[PDB]
Design a protein around this ligand. Structure first.
Ligand code: ADP
Ligand code: ADP
Ligand code: ADP
Ligand code: ADP
Ligand code: ADP
Lengths: 337, 366, 333, 359, 338
């Protein structure tokens, strides 16, 4: 896939944040560009690591998740603060763990596909045949090739490791061999980290990327800042993305025989509700949309069974009825939303 | 496939009141069945709607989670969030959850083997009495004397093992507990409010970051197998009097879409809890004293003054919720529970005068 | 066991002196065990053991009641100091060490059975026959049933884990203990054990703190409460003689081994109890444990010469007690 | 052994400290008295533990060492401060490991006799193959005992025969019986864990199950601590035994204070004890062909030298005698090879010559 | 070995220069080993090794005496830094010692196998595979793995460096290490995968500068387990000149044979050696005194140009003279910052 083909696929899931989509696409394209090179340059070239920057919940992780899911690559998210108190080599360990017929012959074959120890026996042959078809030395060694060639690692909240300054910067030095390249031992095999791609992310409000150790700053060639989502983006996130949470709730109630429909003004007042809570108390980003939506739909989701065969409409009046009383009280909103 | 009203109606048989918490947990369990009906793509994108219970201790937050999992026959575990402040790894939650799912699926599988094994064990022991060369007449004549009762007597126990071992399938069982954990698993994290936010704030919020992969989804290794946490349901609870859910790390606040506050229990609810729930503690004491041949009966005014006694202690000193009912009842019944052997064949009646006699002197002194 | 609660206390009176309320409280818990088994399938799960919290000064027999109670029921038993977990070891070790005691308990008891049949069918033959007679799956699984059904655990000095820095570590131990009483499942090399029906006995002086200082989930898991009274001088005189295999009876048979006959006068027993009481008041009160230190100091001269005194009848009188003791009791230093 | 026989044997090694000798003798004698009792009392009776008290180096440990060596019992010395940092159960584990090597080497001593007889009968079969002892059978038995792969083969038969004679289930289980019935443990510097007060008293609670009785798992087997005897020791100048936790104070029924050694005690310790350090240096130089002899005034000035150092700097007790003696004899001990066939005399003038400049 | 104490010192003089008191002290300990075996069954248990405490500034040869002493006795040896345990279990000392004794007795057993195997392999005949099968056929593992245990228990030697640094907060952890070391000297038994070893008869050598602390600051139980005390003197400029040449396989002799490998012949003038010792002394006085270790840093700095060109210099005879030493050094010794 060309870099524009990657961004266009990411637009199907993430909304906006095109600069982060363009930056990740360059890294994945360099993978294919490297394989076309000669024996010497393939060793000298190393992945272009990315450092995402921005407030929480704007989709930094989702880009890394959909990117690895787009490439079918191994992926893991690790909190950098986990190591302030486990060995750093566990990152690669957990990454590898995630990585002509007779007439009676047809007459019985028909009754078999139609359905029918006998019934238990069909399941045991799937194991014996799939084991006979599978190649374990080509499989356990494939996950190693999938990690080494295609592997991806997302390091969240890297800005928080910038008394404590020795332990904080000590985690950076422990992370250093993985990016500069090294070899880690695992029960599944011996993995090399040279060509693994990495994505670090942090708000960087307390610290700056310059505060990172110099050896780490040079191993993160690509830098990108992700913009904060607005109320208008909340309305888009509720609907536009494939399998959006509103589409999920609609199909969920459809299973009960109920038909949910959201008005544009009803969607607009949900985004306004999630925005008010982030401003009134604490800003969690687009994550607030999930808490507000379930609070609005809790009465329908409970009653949907008796509501089978009915068409429910979520309007602006319905949103204000179940929400504005909760959003008006900030003491309650921190608990309930 | 129970509908959400069927879930609360079942929960009303045990928990009293707290309907909003019942409605909230029912929505999460129903989304499980609603997800399976969806297509291949949506089943991955949809994730469990996690709940945050809030309220004073002892109002039934855990009992809702306990009866909900018991209602679904799902694996369940309660974990204290403060255990990780000191230390143990956070991954142990899934490990201990699978160990409960293993024993759960195993004992339930024994319930299946308990039947078939007795039939195959009988056919084995009849081969020694009537060796083979429609059941034979002597085959039934011995089969009758066997069921009537009778090394020989030890032999029937050994065949239950060999037959249940011959009947059990370990690859469908140990892999069943994994499917029970991944699909149906439930985890209750008590006192999550105590890990909210300088020195402790790093160790407190560090536990939140350690918990983060389990809710965002991850893979944990266990001796029983490799489990994925993506579809596991979680229930966090806390009083949140010192802190508020907004004090939680932002990645955690968005992984708890459903929030509910549980109301403080009243004196009237205490009277209902003593009697109304199936196998209520009063019914338990009644059958226990029946074992000794004694008949316990509680008057409505006697039940009313026990609930008033437990309420006064929670207000006079510390409010433990409905847990106070257990301490008060045993203190009232301790004299009968000691004498029940000698009281066999007698009808004892717990009245308002009896409750005040054994209690009011104790409740009067804080 | 089907013993009625009065039969339990009467058996406990053979060892412990006084503290009847603690005896009555433990008997109710053991009787509820037999009462539960007669119930139906539903109530047997809902009913849970009535846990007891002993309260009182050290050395008044809190542990002995739990020890003799488990010994009376032939149940597995373990004593654990709650402060051990302040530093560290996992709390689940309680069930692990309990099963290890239950394993050795059911094994040595199973040896007593195979001891009989193997001698008929038969040192080497005792092993082959007992192995031929034993069914290890009924034994290692018996200790599990003995722990789950009959198990008992005594948690000493629980008052010291009550409630800023230590209060987190102190109350943290309470939360770690919480699953065991509320019920849970612990994995052991011997098997998988469930804690739902295990009985527990917590004890503490509670002079610094109070049971109300315990976490609320823990206060509701200890339905039965009892306070143990301080021992008097008269109880010391009873402890010296009345209990089966009392320390005076132990010294008598010990000297009987050497051919010597010890006999204690009532006034001689009376002045030993007065001696142990004065030391507890003059310096520090250790409870009935003082009786052990005072008696050995009195008998050290007889115990030393007992070989040469074979064939003699020695009498411990009030004059003998004052001769070897009062000079020592007079100096508190 | 009766308690007077124990103290009299202890006097052959330790000098003075009779009260500590009388106290340890009562504990070892209660062991034999318990076995003679009935089934019930043998369980109820528990060892009478001892708490030694006094300044360092006065022989507290030597009493425990010679006591266990007198009883052939397993023994271990453990520093209580080792657990301040970090498990207490290792005490029983290391105790059994010493008991394993103790019973094993002692079992080799038994097989040492019979195996030489059976090994000789094996080696005579190759020299005198069989078709009253034969003429050549004795003729080779004589040349064999006179001395002579051949020479290597006699060692291999000692293993096969000692293995054929030994019963390992009676051995690894014997060390367990030696630990449970006869075991002894010396806990040095117990006073330093008295009321850090949480970590100090926490070690006491960790030690509590071992004295109150418990069961510890080991690779060699499962051991019970109920009947093991223990000896705790401490200077108790900073703290007192009353500062110990109450459950620990009642598990130490016997208390004894050991007196500080005097200059007169030093002179006795140098000579009177069996295999005293002066006797050791004498036999060592005798190996080189030299004769050491110490004058009474020369012994008197060595004791005065060790006393002055303990007073002038730090008092280490009788341990000072070892450092002073080796410093005096270092010139002889080096030259002992060339001094063979000579009689050296250690006099007061010799002691002052090599020492007083240092003191 | 039956060597007398003077024979031990005379052999030590072939390697170490001076420090005769430390040589006499170590010789008395090794001789007591042979003196003990001649005693009866009783005295052999009661007598215990006379442990030594070396004292002096760093680099004066405290370790070299312990190394050459064990190498002289063919005994197992290990050097352990006492500060390693301030933060591993102390029992690892005996474990690592047995691991050195295992490889010591094994390679030495190969020296007996290297000969016989070649004869039996010739009779069989691939030549490399038969050395294994024959050496495995000739080797006795129960006499070997048990030999290293006898070598550790009877002949074992341990050197504990910088013991003076373990003499309120650190004082507990510092003195805690002493108590952990105490059982090893008083005698004990340690479990190892190779077997069960007893420490009663092992000899130990502790060393420290003792400028911050004194041996009296050691715990009393440890002071009595170190009967022999010796102080090692600081090396002079004249001693540096001797250390460069006199000792067998001296660093000057090592550099000469190294350049001989390239076909070059190195020769040092007496004045050239004299100006090397003067160079190392000036650095120790001008900045920090590291002892004789300064000789290694100065020599390699002087010879770095020859060591670089030695390939192209094959067949040539080099002479290190006073003019050559001053040319490559005095400019560096001048500037103390460099
Ligand atoms: N641009 C976006 N498109 C789709 N979903 C989003 C977007 N931004 C946030 N989300 C939702 O909010 C959550 C974002 O969390 P995460 O990406 O881990 O935070 P961050 O991006 O700060 O690392 C995800 O669960 C995701 O479903
Ligand atoms: N509504 C209720 N119905 C029935 N029992 C209750 C109720 N509330 C509390 N209880 C009893 O009190 C205890 C509640 O403890 P728990 O539910 O763990 O506290 P919380 O709800 O604060 O987490 C349980 O043992 C339960 O038997
Ligand atoms: N009432 C009693 N009857 C018999 N022995 C007693 C009694 N009280 C104390 N003892 C003796 O004193 C000791 C009591 O210790 P323990 O019971 O552990 O203390 P606590 O009761 O405070 O937990 C035991 O060794 C026991 O032999
Ligand atoms: N009374 C004594 N008799 C013989 N040797 C003694 C005596 N007192 C001390 N020693 C010697 O001094 C050392 C005493 O150390 P130790 O007994 O461990 O000290 P403590 O008695 O304070 O525990 C031993 O090496 C021992 O040889
Ligand atoms: N007297 C000496 N004879 C020979 N070499 C010595 C001498 N003194 C020091 N050395 C050399 O210097 C180094 C001394 O280090 P070491 O002996 O470990 O120091 P220390 O003696 O302080 O323990 C060794 O590498 C050794 O080669």
């Amino acid at each position: 896939m060309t870099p524009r083909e990657i961004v266009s696929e990411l637009d199907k899931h993430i909304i906006g944040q095109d600069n982060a989509k363009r930056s990740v696409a360059i890294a994945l394209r360099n993978r294919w560009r490297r394989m076309q090179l000669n024996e010497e340059l393939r060793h000298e070239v190393t992945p272009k690591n990315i450092l995402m920057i921005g407030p929480t919940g704007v989709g930094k992780t989702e880009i890394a998740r959909r990117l690895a899911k787009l490439a079918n690559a191994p992926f893991i998210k690790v909190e950098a603060t986990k190591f302030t108190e486990k060995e750093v080599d566990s990152i690669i360990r957990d990454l590898t763990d995630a990585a002509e017929p007779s007439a009676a012959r047809q007459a019985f074959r028909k009754k078999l596909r139609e359905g029918q120890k006998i019934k238990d026996a069909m399941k045991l042959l799937i194991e014996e045949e799939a084991a006979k078809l599978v190649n374990p030395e080509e499989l356990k060694q494939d996950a190693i090739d999938a990690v080494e060639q295609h592997g991806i690692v997302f390091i969240d909240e890297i800005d928080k490791i910038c008394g404590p300054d020795v332990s904080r910067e000590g985690v950076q030095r422990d992370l250093l061999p993985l990016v500069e390249g090294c070899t880690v031992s695992t029960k599944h095999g011996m993995v090399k980290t040279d060509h693994i791609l990495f994505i670090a992310s942090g708000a960087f409000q307390i610290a700056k990327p310059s505060d990172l150790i110099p050896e780490l700053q040079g191993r993160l060639p690509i830098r990108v800042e992700l913009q904060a989502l607005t109320t208008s983006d909340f309305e888009r996130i509720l609907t536009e993305p494939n399998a959006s949470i509103t589409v999920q709730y609609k199909a969920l109630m459809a299973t009960e025989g109920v038909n949910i429909e959201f008005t544009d003004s009803g969607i607009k007042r949900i985004a306004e509700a999630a925005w008010q809570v982030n401003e009134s108390t604490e800003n969690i980003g687009a994550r607030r949309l999930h808490t507000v939506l379930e609070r609005l739909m809790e009465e329908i989701s409970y009653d949907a069974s008796d509501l089978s065969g009915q068409n429910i409409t979520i309007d602006a009046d319905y949103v204000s009825k179940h929400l504005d009383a909760l959003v008006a009280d900030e003491d309650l909103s921190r608990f309930i939303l």
